[PDB]
């Protein structure tokens, strides 16, 4: 049965499934730092579900088949051309930033739904609470306008206030010259054009806004580059945290019921991402919108509801 | 009608006029509502006693009960209003227009 | 709010309305009104925020004043005739006070100001309840005491309600305020025919309730409270906007849609008495409601407004909660005119 | 093909389908029977046959 | 070559708190996207 | 005004008095019943369209239930409506029969004895 | 007459069940078959009407109108499929559905036996027309046009409704046969005057009457081609049909209530003909032409003579065909050059000779060259007006001079002179467009061969 | 002078102007309960004198 | 960006003669185009036009023109034979009409 008021009335309660290891974990860090490996190790050791960082096609992997769609029908933005031409007059930069924030919101909703449904913990790379640093690094470099920042702040204000911040925030600190050396050793021709000022802006945003404001909600575990490979020590540092200061201890059955109703129904999660604020970077004309929607509806498993597409092998349609 | 009936009706009219004309405090208007309830209680009791309507004697008590409910309701709302603004002024209830 | 507590409060609202509808004693009718209001106040405050609190406070003040006037009218009627049964209302001053109290409860002009504010301050579900279920009890009482009504006062209030509903709706970009002004105009239409035929009042109430339920359910399905947010729905689900356009046309009263049936019937009834000027005025005034419905239809269905990029993500997900009665409500809102004679079953 | 369960599977919900079909059939049979008895009672009361 | 459709300038006519703005109501603001006004610092 | 609420002998919430059993029931091929079934079919199609299912083929059991429910309600609705109109006619004829002074049958005049003004068109 | 109504209702699901690339073929074929079936209604009697049932009847006035409606549907389909090629399948089916619903409403309107059923259908025709105009029009003005189309109509028709129900409370019936047989004169009182105005103004605004005509240029210019065809050819004739039906209960009040409308019709006929002489948009010229011809029809209905009624019927049929043909002719050039300015594309006879022949024949029928049925209707109305008053021949005469002028002006501007040098995208005429022009024009001359079929019940 | 100006001016433009002005007059209220509760008092007194005193 | 919105450019119009030199202007699909032409020509000209004109031309005389002419011929013959006037100013017999008693 679908979770709802009826399930809550008889039986189902979230508070009982929490078994001292729920602990939503996020592992933040600068570009090219090894935060993903640390998050994978934390998830493996503690037995929590690992969520890889949400990209342009995160929503594609959770709907239909998990395969990504064409960039025209999903995202409509490019990271590679953001690196190539960050000051392009077609609005690619803020479009990419807004789409990435929406993807992060969807991933956070998925992780919260899983945790509240099963009681198992989750480990995320970045979150909606951390995305803004990139936006700041975009604004200080002149890549986006101030109106874009205002729109981003409005959307974040109406979206991020409805969820619970993570239990423990893990940060990996890597100096900018080391990051440049790692990027050069990587070999991707699009990341070599990242100027050091952009990385320094990301680091400044992190260390001056995110960590100070996150430390008030819960204690923050910072690790340098050398003491992050030893994942067992990080895990046993996590295991001895006194987590009784944030909003998580101030949660009972009814608040959990409201949150669980919110985390499912992804349309209600994404409601305020498409607010009618007409920025040229993200506003799409009627003709292009109609053409792109017609193109999307013609994908092999997208015309009808999931179980009603006989062109991908759905049977017994006329009894469903 | 005797003079007493006219006096009670005048009291009800005065309380209604006091409710309809707000100054600043919501509490004063709630007091005017309570006064209207009291006037109705007195008027109904006098009518029921005059005509010796025995079973109607329980009617005014019922009135009082719902008066209390109405009184409680108002007070509850006032609390919330105060918690929003630090005051109970009706000027602050202007977020919604016609 | 706990779902159990919410169910109990909804049941108490409905029980108060039913007590009003089944009572023979004026005290029990007043008690039904009190219980309905007491249970209705928290339902308006379900999603807590300052706007909801303001709407609840305004609603409480209006309804409490109306109930005080109601009780005073009852007591005056008892004084001049020792009667508790709801009947021909032996006193004219008491009848005037009763009419004013019931009009204030219904939101008829000139006691109309609270309706747009309360509707705008609450959620769409609370607005649905307020504009559909809350009309039943006062209209039932008015139908029961119709023979003693003063036609001048009620006709004046009905004409004022139609005029004010049209003029106020002309100025709105918020969908809830549009619905509230539409409700004011439709209440005016309902009360215009009440002194002549209560069956026509019941028919108009039923058709209005069906159309309003379809409207509110379509607005909940596409999470839009403003014109600009409703102008995006075509790029997510065009079927919803097309059904909305047809429903708006029906609410405008155009033949051969169902919304034409009540006005037609009411006009005919008014010409069975003499009453020629008033129906003509009422129809010419309802043209204003048709105008702003048509403007909404222009914004949402007949033209395509620009959209946003993030809308692409919304393409990948489906509506989770489904309204089981929405299709039947739409069909009853649109294609019911050929079954007009079935109104005989209402009397 | 779907990445998720899609709770409505390839086979339809047999309980719901059976309940719906049974309700429709029962309503049709009830309507036929009621119409037959109504015709009989009208004929008896007015004495046509 | 193609049918006219509303653009941003057309759509901005319906984005205000009211149609037919006047001098008095030109300062009315539209309600917040969610119906939550920012909390005042009415310290007691 | 309420014409029929206080009609003597009326049972409060019956919906179908026993006297109505003396009227011929509507035929099962009544065009009004066919239109009610059409309304049910339209409701089923709209249900399919809103749920993003193939409109004509998605649920045949659901569409069948829609049509059946609409027809089932329409039959009794038509019965009650016909009963109400029969009651109105019965009361009207009885009242005309019991008040002959208010309904006189005056003498008939032929058109050869009635003087009608002629208005030429020119 | 369900043998015509049911096949259109069957056109509906046939369109919605058709294969994506066969909608036009199926719709056109079955529309033509329905027109062929409706051709049998022309067998009329000399004494009474064909009373099919309690609900529908056919007269010698409504049968040619029904034939015109059923014949216009396939022409509209042929004219629409060019500019709707880029449209999606569902929206094309919705457009065809709008056209079919309009035909059904018109067919039921022209044959309803009761006046309230007639009113309901005659208002129901509003919705598909408004949807077509505001959804498939090309420019931003269409929205305004739609509003002008709607309220102008409703402000006329809402009083009529009241009057109708009032009449049913007085006489007990709105059946047209009962109304005709039990007719009683209207006395001279203020109440009767306002009843007359309520019964007349809706049809007046439908014609439209001069002074109440401002909605028509907007609606007929901003509409797509099929919308303009059905607005000019059939929807304007609703007013004339309704007036000829309703005038049976308005005597002898009409004898003096017609004076303001007669003066408006004659002077405004002169005025709209004059307006046609200085017009930069080719579609607006055709719209104002329609206004002038309808003013003639209004005069004919108002003077209330058998000759005027015959002339009015003939003129309505002839104008429907001619104005629809002219709108299609203008649409061909618009689709070629994407502009409605008349002087933009000139010398088109050099580039498109057969289309120039079609233009010449259409403009010849517009100026009522004898023995076309346009001329027959115009001459009957002029003779009746001369009997009404010998001075009318002045105004009518002036109209006959102006019409031809602007008509030929239009031709001379578009076909003659030298071609515009920079316009190099004028392709040869398609078979579809030539067939459309022929299917417009041949019935006109065929009807000339047998004019008693469009002369009405008188 | 006639078709584009005065015929527009009399019927449709005047109607639009009047309806717009009345809409502005009716809908522009501050949302203060004080003002329209005073309005309620005025309405009650008028309804008690104009309609109720005459029976 | 010095732009206002992201929009597709207005496309050029397609010439049906480019891909189909004999295109009939009905459809871009040549076969569907040809059959649309054929059905329009057959059901518009061959069926409705010519056969409908023939059907209308031979419609039976339900207007009773020939019957009226023959009746008038008989009436004229009889009246001229017996010397009666061809037509009477009264179409109704006065013996079946009762005028008002007094005109003063
Ligand atoms: C009066 C006489 C009788 C008339 C009755 C009244 C009219 C008919 C009944 C009305 C209700 C019936 C249909 C209701 C459900 C339709 C909803 C829908 O979306 O349709 C899509 C659906 C196609 O969807 P699909 O097949 O799944 O794949 C395509 C995708 O879905 C692609 O879908 P998409 O969503 O991606 O496409 C988007 C599209 C989707 O938007 C729509 O499709 C619009 C549909 C709105 C439904 C109507 C509203 C509610 C009804 C009120 C109607 C009022 C009528 C009165 C006049 C006023 C006019 C408003 O939106 C747009 O493109 C925007 C266009 C803007 C134009 C706005 C105009 C809309 C209002 C016009 C309504 C006209 C009446 C209905 C027209 C036909 C509709 C199918 O259409 C159909 O195929 C169903 C219709 C045909 C089934 C019936 C056939 C019966 C069986 C055949 C045999 C016949 C038996 C005869 C017996 C004899 C034995 C031989
Ligand atoms: C009067 C002579 C009678 C002859 C007996 C047989 C006549 C058979 C005609 C059948 C109907 C005509 C078909 C109409 C469509 C036009 C054909 C077309 O598209 O052209 C392709 C075709 C191919 O040639 P092309 O090399 O490709 O060159 C085409 C270029 O675009 C350039 O081509 P274009 O430069 O060669 O011009 C095309 C031509 C075609 O354009 C047209 O104007 C023809 C349409 C007629 C005018 C429509 C408005 C006038 C209203 C009067 C209605 C009369 C109808 C009567 C009943 C008709 C039954 C269907 O226009 C003209 O040549 C000048 C038009 C001026 C006509 C002035 C006469 C006014 C009325 C006089 C008497 C009428 C009543 C007769 C009885 C009176 C009492 C005894 O062109 C031709 O073959 C020449 C057309 C023949 C001219 C006919 C004119 C006289 C007939 C008038 C009515 C017939 C009455 C028959 C009863 C017996 C007497
Ligand atoms: C917009 C379309 C309108 C539809 C409205 C909802 C339709 C579905 C609701 C189904 C109704 C359920 C009722 C059946 C159970 C029996 C109840 C019965 O006992 O009630 C009777 C009452 O019968 C009901 O009134 C009949 C309900 C039927 C309403 C349909 C008429 C709608 C007008 C015509 C439009 C076409 C409708 C098409 C239907 C799909 C008792 O009469 P009474 O207690 O003495 O009346 C009290 C009030 N009085 C005295 C003041 C009059
Ligand atoms: C833009 C185009 C719109 C459409 C045009 C519609 C045309 C409508 C015009 C109405 C035609 C006549 C209406 C009434 C007939 C006579 C009117 C009156 O002027 O005649 C005299 C009336 O006398 C005086 O004039 C009294 C009327 C004066 C008051 C009327 C106001 C007219 C002023 C102009 C206002 C513009 C109206 C149109 C607004 C758009 C006749 O004397 P009398 O025999 O005693 O009256 C006959 C009726 N009786 C027998 C019952 C008594
Ligand atoms: C491209 C080249 C063009 C030029 C070359 C042409 C070659 C020669 C062909 C031209 C022929 C000349 C025409 C001369 C007339 C001869 C035919 C005429 O005599 O027949 C008429 C008959 O004509 C028909 O009656 C008129 C046709 C009917 C028109 C209906 C059109 C079909 C419907 C199409 C859609 C409707 C749209 C309009 C809605 C109103 C006479 O009728 P009537 O005097 O009695 O007959 C008496 C004897 N009867 C009764 C026993 C038969
Ligand atoms: C007593 C009351 C009488 C009621 C009569 C009401 C007539 C019904 C029509 C109502 C028209 C309302 C139009 C209006 O007031 O708004 C002015 C409007 C503002 O445009 P919006 O769309 O609102 O803004 C969008 C951009 N922000 O200005 C316009 O341009 C309006 C354009 C369309 C108007 C069409 C009106 C046509 C009227 C024809 C005659 C009918 C008049 C009815 C009475 C007839 C006399 C008996
Ligand atoms: N919010 C964002 N804005 C712009 N770029 C982002 C954003 N999030 C991630 N990226 C890009 O993703 C790339 C790699 O992501 P990152 O997690 O830092 O490295 P790794 O894959 O080794 O964990 C980088 O080029 C980074 O710029
Ligand atoms: N109303 C006319 C119509 C008619 C005209 C010409 C005819 O030849 C025949 C009939 C009759 O008589």
Domain ranges in chain B are 3-92
Tell me the shortest Cα–Cα distance from C2 to chain A, in angstroms. Answer: 7
Which chain F positions have a beta carbon within 8 Å of G305's beta carbon?
121
Q: Report residue G102 as tokens.
A: 């309009």
Q: What span, in angstroms and rounded, lies between the C-alpha atoms of E41 and E25?
A: 26
**Nearest C-alpha of chain H: how many angstroms from G220?**
16
- CA F48 to chain centroid, in Å, comes to 31
End-to-end CA distance of chain C: 41
Q: For tokens 């139908």, what's the residue?
A: C143
Query: If you measure from the C-alpha of residue G260 to the centroid of ligand 4, how many angstroms do you get, rounded to a whole number?
Result: 10
Cβ of E7 and I12 within 8 Å?
A: no
Asked if the peptide bond before residue G208 counts as cis, ω within 30 degrees of 0, the response is yes
Residues in chain H closer than 8 A to G148 (CB atoms): 12
Q: Does A293 touch chain F (CB under 8 A)?
A: no
Report the atom number in ligand 2 closest to the C-alpha of G357. Answer: 31
Residue A57: CB atoms within 10 Å:
17
B83, HSE (Cβ side, Cα atoms, 13 Å): 10
Interface membership of F43 toward C (CB under 8 Å)? yes
**In this structure, are residues G135 and G94 in contact, taking their beta carbons and an 8 Å threshold?**
no
Read off the tokens for G238: 């609703």
Please identify among residues 26-55 of chain B the ones whose CB lies closer than 8 Å to any CB of chain E: none
What tokens does C184 get?
A: 């004011």
**For residue A228, how many other CB atoms are within 10 A of its CB?**
24
Domain B3-92 CATH (choose: 3.40.190.10, 3.40.50.300, 3.40.30.10, 1.10.287.3510) = 1.10.287.3510
Contact status, residue C315 vs residue A303, Cβ threshold 8 Å: no
Take residue B23 and report the two structure tokens written for it. Answer: 């100054």
Instruction: Look at the block and give the residue holding tokens 């609410």.
Output: C251
Q: Take residue G423 and report the two structure tokens written for it.
A: 């316009």
Q: In this structure, what token pair is assigned to residue G76?
A: 């509209």
d(CA B8, CA A311): 81
Q: Where are the alpha helices (DSSP H) in chain I?
A: 16-19, 30-41, 52-57, 65-82
Q: Which of H24, H40, H48 sits opposite C171 (nearest CB)?
A: H24
Chains contacting G with at least 3 CB pairs below 8 Å? C, E, F, H, I
* Residue C344 C-beta-side C-alpha neighbours within 13 Å: 16
Residue of C146, C327, C344 with shortest CB distance to F85: C344
Cβ distance of G212 and H8 shorter than 8 Å: no
Nearest to C258 by CA among C326, C189, C345, C333: C333
- Ligand 3 atom having least distance to the Cα of C143: 51
In a domain, F2, yes or no: yes
Nearest CA in chain A to F49: A304
- Residue G239 · residue G208 · CB < 8 Å: yes
C-alpha angle G389-G254-G115 in degrees, rounded to nearest 5 = 135
Q: How many CB atoms lie within 10 A of CB H11?
A: 15
Eight-class DSSP state of A32: T
Q: Which helix (H) or strand (E) holds F37?
A: helix F31-50
Q: What stretch of H or E contains C308?
A: strand C307-308
Nearest to G271 by CA among D10, H1, I51, H23: H1
User: Nearest 5°: phi and psi at C307?
Assistant: -120, -170
For ligand 2, is residue G252 a contact (CB within 6 Å)? no
Asked whether the beta carbons of F35 and F75 are under 8 A apart, the reply is no
Q: Is residue F120 part of a domain?
A: no
Q: How many CB atoms lie within 10 A of CB C242?
A: 16
HSE toward the beta carbon, residue G128, CA cutoff 13 A: 24
Of G247, G374, G362, which is closest to residue G298 (Cα–Cα)? Answer: G247
Q: Indicate whether residue C76 lines ligand 3 (CB < 6 A).
A: no
CA of G366 to the centre of ligand 2 (A): 16
Closest-lying ligand 8 atom to the alpha carbon of residue G310 = 1
Centre of ligand 8 from the C-alpha of residue G455, in Å: 6
Q: Which chains touch D (3 or more CB pairs under 8 A)?
A: A, F
Q: Do D23 and F25 touch (CB under 8 A)?
A: no
Using left for φ > 0, alpha for ψ between -120 and 50, and beta otherwise, residue H48 falls in alpha
Residue A268 assigned ligand-binding role:
no
Cα G284 vs. chain centroid, distance in angstroms? 15
Sorted by sequence, the CB contacts under 8 Å of residue I10 that are 6+ apart come out as: E1, E2
Domain boundaries, position F38:
1-99
- Output the CA H20–ligand 6 centroid distance in Å: 8
CB contact under 8 Å between I4 and A283, yes or no, is yes
Q: Do G120 and C276 touch (CB under 8 A)?
A: no
Report the SS3 class of residue G117.
helix
The beta-strand segments (E) located in C186-318 are 307-308
- Residues in CB range of H25: below 8 A, 6 or more apart: C167
Chain D CB contacts of F72 below 8 Å: 27, 30-31
**Who contacts D5 (Cβ-Cβ below 8 Å, separation ≥6)?**
none
Structural tokens at position F96: 């005309």
Q: What residue spans define the domains of chain E?
A: 1-44
Mutation to test the B interface, candidates H31, H35, H46, H49, most B Cβ within 10 Å: H31
Residue of C nearest to F47 (CA): C327
Does ligand 7 come within 6 angstroms of the Cβ of A131?
Answer: yes
Q: For chain F, what is the domain count? A: 1
SS3 for A28? strand
Helix ranges, chain A (H)? 5-9, 35-46, 79-84, 92-118, 132-140, 146-159, 176-186, 196-205, 211-217, 231-238, 253-263, 266-270, 286-297
Question: Is residue F116 domain-resident?
Answer: no
Q: Give yes or no for a contact between G420 and G345, defined as CB atoms under 8 angstroms apart.
A: yes
Neighbours of G209 (CB within 10 A): 23
F50 lies in some domain: yes
Beta bridge partners of A168: A25
CA neighbor of G446 nearest in space, from I49, I70, C281: I49
Resolution in A: 2.5
Count of residues in chain B = 98
Residue owning tokens 């021949």: G393
Which residues, in sequence order, are CB contacts of I95 under 8 Å at separation 6+? none
* Yes or no, beta carbons of F47 and C330 under 8 Å apart: no
SS (H, E, C) I17-33: HHHCCCCCCCCCCHHHH
């Amino acid at each position: 049965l679908q979770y709802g008021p009826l399930a809550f009335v008889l039986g189902e309660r979230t508070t009982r499934k929490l078994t001292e290891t729920s602990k939503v974990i996020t592992v933040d860090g600068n570009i090219c730092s090894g935060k993903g490996r640390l998050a994978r190790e934390i998830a493996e050791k503690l037995g929590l579900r690992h969520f890889p960082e949400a990209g342009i096609h995160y929503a594609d992997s959770t709907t239909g088949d998990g395969k990504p769609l064409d960039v025209q029908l999903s995202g409509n933005c490019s990271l590679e051309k953001f690196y190539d031409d960050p000051k392009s007059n077609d609005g690619n930069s803020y479009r990419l930033q807004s789409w990435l924030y929406a993807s992060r919101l969807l991933q956070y909703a998925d992780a919260l739904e899983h945790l509240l449904s099963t009681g198992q913990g989750v480990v995320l790379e970045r979150s909606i609470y951390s995305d803004f640093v990139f936006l700041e690094a975009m604004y200080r470099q002149g890549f986006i306008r101030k109106q874009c920042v205002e729109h981003y702040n409005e959307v974040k204000k109406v979206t991020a206030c409805e969820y619970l911040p993570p239990h423990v925030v893990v940060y990996v600190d890597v100096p900018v010259p080391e990051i440049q050396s790692r990027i050069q050793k990587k070999g991707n021709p699009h990341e070599m054009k990242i100027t050091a000022a952009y990385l320094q802006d990301i680091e400044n945003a992190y260390k001056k806004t995110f960590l100070p404001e996150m430390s008030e909600k819960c204690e923050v575990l910072q690790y340098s580059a050398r003491e992050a490979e030893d994942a067992e020590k990080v895990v046993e540092d996590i295991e001895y945290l006194k987590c009784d200061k944030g909003p998580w201890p101030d949660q009972d059955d009814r608040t959990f019921h409201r949150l669980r109703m919110l985390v499912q129904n992804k349309l209600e999660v994404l409601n305020y991402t498409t607010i009618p604020v007409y920025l040229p970077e993200i506003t799409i004309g009627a003709h292009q919108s109609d053409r792109v929607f017609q193109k999307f509806t013609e994908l092999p498993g997208r015309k009808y509801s999931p179980g009603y597409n006989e062109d991908v092998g759905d049977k017994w349609i006329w009894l469903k | 009608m005797p003079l007493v009936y006219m006096n009670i009706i005048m009291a009800f009219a005065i309380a209604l006029a006091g409710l309809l004309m707000y100054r600043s405090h919501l509490m004063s208007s709630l007091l005017c509502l309570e006064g209207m309830m009291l006037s109705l209680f007195i008027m109904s009791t006098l009518i029921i006693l005059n005509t010796h309507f025995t079973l109607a004697n329980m009617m005014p008590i019922i009135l009082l009960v719902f008066a209390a409910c109405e009184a409680a309701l108002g007070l509850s709302l006032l609390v919330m209003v105060s918690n929003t603004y630090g005051t109970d002024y009706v000027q602050n209830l202007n977020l919604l227009q016609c | 709010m706990n779902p159990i507590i919410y169910t109990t409060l909804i049941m108490t609202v409905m029980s108060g309305t039913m007590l009003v509808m089944i009572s023979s004693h004026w005290l029990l009718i007043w008690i039904g009104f009190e219980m309905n209001l007491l249970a209705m106040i928290p339902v308006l405050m379900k999603n807590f925020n300052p706007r909801a609190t303001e709407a609840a406070t305004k609603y409480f003040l209006t309804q409490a004043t109306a109930s005080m006037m109601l009780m005073m009218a009852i007591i005056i009627n008892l004084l001049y005739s020792g009667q508790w049964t709801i009947t021909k209302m032996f006193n004219p001053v008491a009848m005037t006070m009763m009419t004013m109290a019931l009009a204030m409860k219904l939101g008829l002009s000139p006691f109309h100001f609270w309706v747009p504010e309360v509707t705008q301050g609450i959620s769409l579900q609370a607005g649905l309840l307020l504009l559909t279920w809350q009309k039943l009890a006062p209209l039932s009482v008015l139908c029961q005491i119709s023979q003693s009504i003063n036609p001048n006062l009620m006709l004046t209030m009905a004409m004022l309600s139609i005029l004010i509903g049209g003029w106020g709706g002309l100025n709105q970009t918020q969908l809830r305020k549009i619905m509230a002004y539409s409700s004011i105009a439709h209440m005016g239409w309902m009360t215009a025919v009440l002194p002549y035929n209560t069956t026509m009042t019941i028919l108009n109430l039923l058709i209005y309730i069906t159309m309003t339920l379809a409207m509110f359910m379509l607005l909940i399905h596409s999470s839009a409270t403003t014109t600009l947010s409703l102008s995006h729905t075509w790029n997510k689900m065009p079927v919803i906007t097309s059904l909305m356009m047809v429903t708006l046309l029906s609410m405008g009263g155009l033949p051969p849609l169902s919304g034409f049936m009540p006005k037609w019937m009411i006009i005919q009834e008014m010409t069975k008495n003499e009453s020629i000027i008033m129906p003509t005025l009422m129809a010419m005034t309802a043209l204003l409601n048709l105008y702003f419905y048509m403007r909404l239809a222009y914004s949402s269905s007949l033209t395509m407004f620009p959209s946003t990029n993030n809308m692409k993500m919304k393409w990948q997900f489906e509506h989770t909660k489904q309204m089981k009665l929405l299709p039947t409500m739409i069909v009853l809102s649109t294609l019911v005119l050929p079954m007009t004679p079935a109104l005989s079953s209402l009397n | 093909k779907f990445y998720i369960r899609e709770p409505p599977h390839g086979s339809p919900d047999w309980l719901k389908v059976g309940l719906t079909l049974g309700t429709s059939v029962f309503l049709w049979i009830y309507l036929i029977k009621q119409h037959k008895e109504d015709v009989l009672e009208y004929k008896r009361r007015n004495g046509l046959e | 070559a193609r049918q006219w459709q509303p653009d941003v300038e057309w759509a901005e006519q319906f984005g205000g708190a009211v149609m037919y703005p006047t001098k008095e109501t030109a300062h009315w603001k539209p309600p917040p996207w969610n119906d939550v006004d920012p909390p005042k610092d009415t310290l007691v | 005004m309420t014409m029929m609420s206080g009609r003597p002998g009326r049972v409060p919430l019956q919906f179908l008095p026993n006297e109505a059993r003396s009227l011929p029931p509507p035929k099962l091929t009544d065009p009004r019943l066919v239109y009610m079934g059409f309304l049910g079919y339209c409701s089923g199609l709209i249900d399919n369209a809103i749920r993003r299912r193939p409109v004509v083929s998605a649920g045949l059991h659901r569409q069948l239930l829609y049509v059946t429910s609409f027809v089932f309600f329409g039959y009794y609705l038509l019965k009650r409506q016909d009963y109400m109109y029969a009651l109105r006619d019965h009361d009207m004829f009885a009242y005309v029969k019991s008040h002959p002074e208010d309904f006189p049958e005056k003498d008939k005049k032929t058109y050869g004895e009635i003087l009608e003004e002629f208005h030429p068109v020119r | 007459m369900l043998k015509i109504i049911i096949p259109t209702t069957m056109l509906l699901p046939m369109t919605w069940m058709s294969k994506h690339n066969m909608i036009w073929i199926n719709a056109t074929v079955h529309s033509l078959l329905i027109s062929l079936i409706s051709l049998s209604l022309l067998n009329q009697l000399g004494e009474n009407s064909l009373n099919f049932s309690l609900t529908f009847f056919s007269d010698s006035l409504s049968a040619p109108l029904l034939v015109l409606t059923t014949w216009l549907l396939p022409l509209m389909l042929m004219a629409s499929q060019s500019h709707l090629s880029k449209e999606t399948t569902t929206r094309k089916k919705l457009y065809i559905t709008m056209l079919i619903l309009l035909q059904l409403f018109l067919i039921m309107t022209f044959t309803a036996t009761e006046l309230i059923l007639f009113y309901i259908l005659f208002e129901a025709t509003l919705v598909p027309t408004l949807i077509i105009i505001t959804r498939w029009g090309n420019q931003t003005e269409r929205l305004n046009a739609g509003l002008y189309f709607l309220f102008y109509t409703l402000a006329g028709s809402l009083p009529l409704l009241v009057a109708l129900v009032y009449i049913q409370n007085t006489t007990g019936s709105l059946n047209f046969l009962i109304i005709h047989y039990w007719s009683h004169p209207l006395s001279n009182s203020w109440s009767n005057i306002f009843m007359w105005l309520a019964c007349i103004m809706a049809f007046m605004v439908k014609m439209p009457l001069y002074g109440l005509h401002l909605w028509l240029p907007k609606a007929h210019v901003e509409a797509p081609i099929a919308g303009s065809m059905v607005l000019a050819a059939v929807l304007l004739k609703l007013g004339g049909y309704g007036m000829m039906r309703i005038t049976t209960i308005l005597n002898p009040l009409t004898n003096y209530m017609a004076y303001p409308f007669l003066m408006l019709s004659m002077w405004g006929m002169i005025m709209t003909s004059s307006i046609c002489l200085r017009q930069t948009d080719l579609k607006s010229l055709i719209a104002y032409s329609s206004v002038s011809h309808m003013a003639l029809v209004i005069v004919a209905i108002m003077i209330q003579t058998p000759w005027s009624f015959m002339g009015a019927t003939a003129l309505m049929i002839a104008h429907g065909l001619t104005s629809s043909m002219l709108f299609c002719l203008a649409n061909t050039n618009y689709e070629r050059v994407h502009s409605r300015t008349m002087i933009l594309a000139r010398g088109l006879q050099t580039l498109l000779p057969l289309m120039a022949t079609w233009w010449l024949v259409a403009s010849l029928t517009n100026l009522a060259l004898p023995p076309s049925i346009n001329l027959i209707g115009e001459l009957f109305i002029i003779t009746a007006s001369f009997s009404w008053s010998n001075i009318t021949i002045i105004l009518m005469g002036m109209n006959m001079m102006i019409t031809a002028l602007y008509s030929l002006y239009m031709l001379i501007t578009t076909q003659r002179g030298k071609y515009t040098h920079h316009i190099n995208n004028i392709k040869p005429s398609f078979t579809r467009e030539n067939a459309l022009m022929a299917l417009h024009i041949l019935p006109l001359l065929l009807l000339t061969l047998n004019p008693k079929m469009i002369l009405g019940p008188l | 002078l006639l078709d584009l100006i005065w015929l527009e001016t009399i019927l449709p433009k005047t109607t639009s102007f009047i309806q717009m002005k009345m809409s502005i007059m009716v809908s522009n209220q501050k949302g203060l309960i004080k003002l329209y509760f005073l309005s309620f008092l005025i309405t009650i007194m008028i309804s008690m004198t104009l309609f109720n005193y005459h029976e | 960006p010095t732009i206002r919105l992201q929009e597709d450019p207005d496309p050029e119009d397609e010439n049906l003669y480019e891909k189909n030199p004999d295109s009939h202007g009905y459809d871009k699909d040549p076969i569907v185009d040809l059959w649309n032409m054929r059905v329009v020509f057959f059901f518009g000209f061959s069926i409705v036009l010519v056969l409908g004109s023939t059907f209308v031309a031979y419609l039976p005389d339900y207007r009773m023109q020939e019957w009226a002419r023959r009746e008038a011929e008989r009436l004229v013959k009889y009246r001229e034979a017996n010397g009666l006037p061809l037509m009477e100013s009264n179409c109704f017999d006065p013996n079946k009409i009762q005028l008002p008693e007094d005109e003063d």
